[PDB]
Design a protein around this motif. Structure first.
Motif, PDB file in Angstrom:
ATOM      1  N   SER A   9       0.806  -1.204   0.000  1.00  0.00           N
ATOM      2  CA  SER A   9       0.000   0.000   0.000  1.00  0.00           C
ATOM      3  C   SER A   9       0.842   1.256   0.000  1.00  0.00           C
ATOM      4  CB  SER A   9      -0.924   0.024   1.209  1.00  0.00           C
ATOM      5  OG  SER A   9      -0.212   0.475   2.338  1.00  0.00           O
TER       6      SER A   9
ATOM      7  N   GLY B 129      -0.835  -0.248  -4.167  1.00  0.00           N
ATOM      8  CA  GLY B 129      -1.862   0.657  -3.691  1.00  0.00           C
ATOM      9  C   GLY B 129      -3.192   0.028  -3.331  1.00  0.00           C
ATOM     10  N   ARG B 130      -4.248   0.446  -4.015  1.00  0.00           N
ATOM     11  CA  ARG B 130      -5.604   0.160  -3.573  1.00  0.00           C
ATOM     12  C   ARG B 130      -6.041  -1.234  -4.009  1.00  0.00           C
ATOM     13  NH1 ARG B 130      -9.798   2.075  -0.394  1.00  0.00           N
ATOM     14  NH2 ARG B 130     -11.777   1.433  -1.332  1.00  0.00           N
TER      15      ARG B 130
ATOM     16  N   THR C 241      -9.509  -2.286  -3.568  1.00  0.00           N
ATOM     17  CA  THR C 241     -10.961  -2.256  -3.657  1.00  0.00           C
ATOM     18  C   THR C 241     -11.540  -3.443  -2.901  1.00  0.00           C
ATOM     19  OG1 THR C 241     -10.909  -3.316  -5.842  1.00  0.00           O
ATOM     20  CG2 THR C 241     -11.040  -0.930  -5.740  1.00  0.00           C
TER      21      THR C 241
ATOM     22  N   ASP D 241      -0.759  -2.301   5.548  1.00  0.00           N
ATOM     23  CA  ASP D 241      -1.401  -3.102   4.516  1.00  0.00           C
ATOM     24  C   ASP D 241      -2.320  -4.124   5.154  1.00  0.00           C
ATOM     25  OD1 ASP D 241      -1.901  -4.646   2.124  1.00  0.00           O
ATOM     26  OD2 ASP D 241      -0.060  -3.840   1.332  1.00  0.00           O
TER      27      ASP D 241
END
Lengths: 218, 107, 227, 120, 129, 82
Positions: free
Chosen positions: A74, A96-97, A99, A125
């Motif tokens: 992350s 990163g993301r 969802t 994370d």
RNA sequence: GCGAUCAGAUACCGCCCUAGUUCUAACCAUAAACGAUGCCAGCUAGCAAUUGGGUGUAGCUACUUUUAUGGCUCUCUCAGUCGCUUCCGGGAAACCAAAGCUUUUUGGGCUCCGGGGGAAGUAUGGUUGCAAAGCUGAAACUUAAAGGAAUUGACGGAAGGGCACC
RNA sequence: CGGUAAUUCCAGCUCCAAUAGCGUAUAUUAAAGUUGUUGCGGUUAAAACGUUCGUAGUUGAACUUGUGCUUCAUAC
């Protein structure tokens, strides 16, 4: 032997300040901390945490699909290493993301179904770790002293707050995934550098060109 | 239905704790269950400083301030809105917020 | 008529449509996420009867003025050794029970049936005694000899006539009118029977094939092999 | 300020720009002309919007383009932004820096007697 | 005061079984305790346990395995004849198949499946399954 | 489990936790098959032959299943010189 | 007792003050006397402070001196207490490191207490008190609910927002 | 339920349950883990004395002949 410690690497491990551990220890992680300086430098064992790598390496093989090992991060300082780690091995880079939740997927005919999550930090994370708690997933996390260990197997105690530590261990992972039936001709010195998993500078990226072609006019 | 972990406020092993008259209704409310506010306020309030320092004799003298530790009944600091109505997940905090600047009313 | 062959969505149901797993308890063997009911339409479906227990209405107070949605229960059980439980709220009673029978199929779990006192002839009741609490009702299943059928309230007798448990003793404390907490209490008692380390289960296993290992090629291929 | 952009002008501005940034201009009046090509519209004030918004962001991709867009031309530059800069390594070539108690760990564990010197 | 000294080994075995410990440090080691765990040791519900001696009362370090569920202790020691020994094996023992009721008969501490063989009756001590 | 006429009667046998012996409940979704593979002792050269480890949710939810690998790692000698 | 306020105001607000408040001598024996959580014992996890006392500085600092008494910091340990974090324990939940180990018909001792709501802490007897009152303490009759915790209904006379010339 | 289209009322048709049996009252037992030793509950639903002391009573740690050694009868 070759599967032993090979102390040319500790010469590089001092550089990434892996000895430097955080102040707060969290008794699961105390089994790796060698000792402490006065006023908060918890020096970990360096051969324990190197022995975790080959233990992590002896784990990461016998997954016949190199696709089905989800490397994640992350933090962006953990991001330039991780997508570049998936250049050589065929792992899926997740920068990163996430969802949440990935778990009845959208367009993809096959699923985004992992089989061994691996993660640069269990603190920040934390989201897909506790989402790896549903679909039967072994999770290797790069750890400091202050870390959760919930649904973590195994931990790898390095430093995980400097740019250089995560910059090192993904190269340290990059060796042993290829040394062990990954056909790098049995631990020879490396054609790829051990510093490409680094920020060339912290963002924003200064005008450091490809192989640093310097400007002859000002 | 118990609303607070500590009930009213902060009475740990004393049995019973002394009262204090609230500052502006003179209500006997105890010491630990008292919204204590502690003002260090200037004596000219920030606009007569440019007027006093004209008619100062000295090299700006710099002017003193007030020092008082005000106590409040719980109604008389919801009505004055020193303290209001936090959420159910924010009745559990004590440590934040200021988050913006140095706080005013000193200044 | 199907009329629609199910799509393999996850990697698990990929294999049962491709037939690489032909035994239902293999996913029970490693405790997989059984998240398509189209899995259990393959293995079972022959001999899987639905019974509802209640179509309990439930309401919400909007500003003008009420609104009713329906928490229909359904209970599926293969008549020897698998049981499920289904609960869902929706705007119509049909769109509960057409979808409640989904939600029971996803949670279908295996029953251990054990001999009461003398191991002869296809064990029937329960190996140990088990309590399942779901909110202040707690049904306490107990073995019984052959030929004394399921003694309970009429509701979880239907949870056990469809579970394959043949001759059981039960006793239920608490507000036994709340049907949600009286179905689920027994459901969390029947399903327990394979989670209790009886001394018969000490010698272990070779401990694994983990079929994502055993069939790593078909998930390595992206080509949707038919049949 | 008070003329915000709706979904359709927002959700089509991306899907033409990440595709047809090439052979696209900054000139709105000819950017008016290209929207009837690369997509269809039922009405001309929407081309007053869906060309006006892409041109109110067209220069913005030159100067620090925002997230949610992939111009297909910066990422191939990002391969060169995956540059190894030579030659960063061990800094004082060993490094000689040691916390002076893990120098024991450089001896009790490691057989390397190499120069890791005490700095307090 | 420390009333029942059998009992809180069994609530230190059962308590430390649930969290899944592997070794357990009892205190202070009755010779009814060691007679109890040896009954739990012939059936393998326990490891090999070592008695770290003091000149005070004894301390036991027990090895745990992870095969058992609950060792309890029937206080007070109800007098259990042979005829009402079957009453308890319904209650304390969760199936007719396994499980054990340890009782002190006069011919040495044995579980019920020995005393219903040796035709002895005694007072009840505890149980395990 | 098995009746007198030699039959593993009902349905199956569950895997037990390789760490602390407990059962794997048939809905345990923090369960695992951890297949650590061995290696040639000379240099590199991953060999076939793994070590399969099964670890329940009750141990991982404590968080005490980083080290509970290591005990199963050391007793199998897979992690070495500890 | 006034002065207001109000439709009225034996109230709130305002003024006057009396018993009382205060000190010794006794009586009274109650309180939301609350942690609405009896007491003795063992166990089951972190982390942060934190009052005493102990202990190691392989710490600083005080200057009486590098010192030594004193302070601080670091390390450990008792006796704890307070908070958080969580169960990976319980609960109807709100929650609780005990309100947990009360498991599957459960057992570390011990005492006090509760049995739908009223009637009613009433009636009557005994007993204590100068008295106020305290402890003991019913029933006839009445009745299907009364109650606990939580959700969703009031951007309906509560805060904080954000609109428009119904 | 009945307050002027009664699935409960008065009926008619129908239908059900037992059947030489069936209804009604009071009583009693089981349901009642709502008297609870097995087996209840007491932070907030009823319920921990204001406090501690303390006879009656209840309840009280550890330790004081235990496996060896040889044989046979005896499972194999």
């Amino acid at each position: 032997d070759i599967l032993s410690l090979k102390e040319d690497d500790i010469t590089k491990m001092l550089v990434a300040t892996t000895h430097l551990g955080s102040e707060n220890v969290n008794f699961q992680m105390e089994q790796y901390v060698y000792k402490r300086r006065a006023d908060g430098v918890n020096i970990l064992n360096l051969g324990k945490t190197w022995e975790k790598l080959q233990l992590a390496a002896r784990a990461i093989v016998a997954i016949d699909n190199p696709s089905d090992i989800f490397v994640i991060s992350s933090r962006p300082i953990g991001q330039r290493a991780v997508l570049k780690f998936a250049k050589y091995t065929d792992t899926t880079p997740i920068a990163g993301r996430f969802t949440p939740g990935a778990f009845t997927n959208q367009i993809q005919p096959a699923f985004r179904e992992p089989r061994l999550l691996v993660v640069t930090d269990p603190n920040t994370d934390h989201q897909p770790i506790m989402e790896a708690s549903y679909v039967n997933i072994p999770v290797i996390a790069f750890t400091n002293t202050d870390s959760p260990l919930r649904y973590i197997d195994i931990a790898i105690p390095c430093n995980n707050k400097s740019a250089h530590s995560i910059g090192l261990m993904w190269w340290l992972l990059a060796r042993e995934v290829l040394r062990l039936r990954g056909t790098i001709s049995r631990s020879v010195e490396w054609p790829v550098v051990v510093d490409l998993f680094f920020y060339r500078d912290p963002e924003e990226a200064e005008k450091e060109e490809a192989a640093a072609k310097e400007l002859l006019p000002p | 239905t118990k609303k607070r972990r500590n009930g009213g406020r902060n009475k740990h092993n004393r049995g019973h704790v002394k009262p204090v008259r609230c500052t502006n209704c003179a209500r006997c409310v105890p010491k630990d269950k008292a919204i204590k506010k502690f003002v260090i306020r200037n004596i000219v309030e920030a606009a007569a400083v440019r007027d006093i320092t004209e008619a100062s004799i000295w090299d700006s003298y710099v002017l003193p301030k007030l020092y008082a530790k005000l106590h409040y009944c719980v109604s008389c600091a919801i009505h004055s809105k020193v303290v209001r109505n936090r959420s159910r997940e924010a009745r559990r905090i004590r440590t934040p917020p200021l988050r913006s600047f140095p706080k005013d009313m000193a200044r | 008529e199907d009329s629609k062959e199910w799509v393999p969505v996850t990697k698990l149901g990929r294999l049962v449509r491709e037939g690489k797993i032909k035994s239902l308890e293999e996913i029970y063997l490693y405790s997989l996420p059984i998240k398509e009911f189209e899995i259990i339409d393959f293995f079972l479906g022959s001999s899987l009867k639905d019974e509802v227990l209640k179509i309990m209405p439930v309401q919400k107070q909007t500003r003008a003025g009420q609104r009713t949605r329906f928490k229909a229960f359904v209970a599926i059980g293969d008549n020897n050794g698998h049981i499920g439980l289904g609960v869902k709220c929706s705007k119509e009673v049909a769109t509960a029970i057409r979808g409640a029978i989904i939600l029971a199929k996803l949670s279908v779990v295996p029953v251990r049936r054990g001999y009461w006192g003398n191991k002869i002839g296809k064990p029937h009741t329960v190996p140990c005694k088990v309590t399942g609490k779901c909110g202040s009702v707690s049904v306490r299943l107990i073995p019984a000899p052959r030929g004394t059928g399921i003694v309970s309230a009429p509701v979880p007798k239907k949870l056990l006539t469809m579970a394959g448990i043949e001759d059981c003793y039960t006793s239920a404390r608490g507000s036994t009118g709340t049907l949600g907490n009286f179905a689920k209490a027994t459901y969390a008692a029947i399903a327990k029977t394979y989670a209790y380390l009886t001394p018969d289960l000490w010698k272990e296993m070779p401990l694994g094939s983990t079929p994502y290992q055993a069939y790593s090629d078909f998930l390595s291929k992206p080509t949707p092999r038919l049949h | 300020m008070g003329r915000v952009r709706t979904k359709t002008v927002k959700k089509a501005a991306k899907v033409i720009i990440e595709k047809y940034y090439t052979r696209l201009t900054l000139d709105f009046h000819t950017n008016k002309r290209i929207c009837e090509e690369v997509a269809i519209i039922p009405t001309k004030p929407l081309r007053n919007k869906i060309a006006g918004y892409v041109t109110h962001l067209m220069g913005r991709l030159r100067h620090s383009q925002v997230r949610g867009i992939s111009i297909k031309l910066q990422e191939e530059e990002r391969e060169r932004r995956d540059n190894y800069v030579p030659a960063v390594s061990a800094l004082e070539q060993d490094i000689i820096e040691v916390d002076a108690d893990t120098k024991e760990m450089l001896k009790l564990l490691d057989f390397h007697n190499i120069r890791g010197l005490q700095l307090t | 005061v420390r009333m029942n000294v059998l009992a809180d080994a069994l609530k230190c075995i059962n308590n430390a079984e649930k969290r899944g410990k592997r070794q357990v440090l009892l205190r202070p080691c009755s010779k009814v305790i060691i007679k109890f765990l040896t009954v739990m040791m012939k059936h393998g519900y326990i490891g090999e346990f070592e008695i770290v001696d003091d000149h005070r009362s004894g301390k036991i370090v027990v090895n745990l395995t992870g095969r058992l569920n609950k060792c309890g202790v029937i206080s007070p020691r109800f007098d259990v004849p042979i005829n009402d020994i079957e009453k308890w094996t319904n209650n304390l023992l969760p199936s007719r198949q396994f499980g054990y009721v340890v009782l002190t008969t006069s011919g040495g501490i044995m579980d019920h499946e020995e005393a219903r063989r040796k035709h002895l009756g005694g007072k009840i001590l505890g149980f395990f399954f | 489990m098995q009746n007198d006429a030699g039959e593993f009667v009902d349905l199956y046998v569950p895997r037990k936790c390789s760490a602390s012996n407990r059962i794997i409940g048939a809905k345990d979704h923090a369960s695992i098959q951890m297949n650590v593979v061995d290696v040639d002792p000379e240099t590199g050269r991953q060999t076939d032959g793994s070590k399969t480890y099964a670890i329940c949710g009750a141990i991982r939810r404590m968080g005490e299943s980083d080290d509970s690998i290591l005990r199963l790692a050391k007793a199998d000698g897979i992690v070495s010189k500890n």
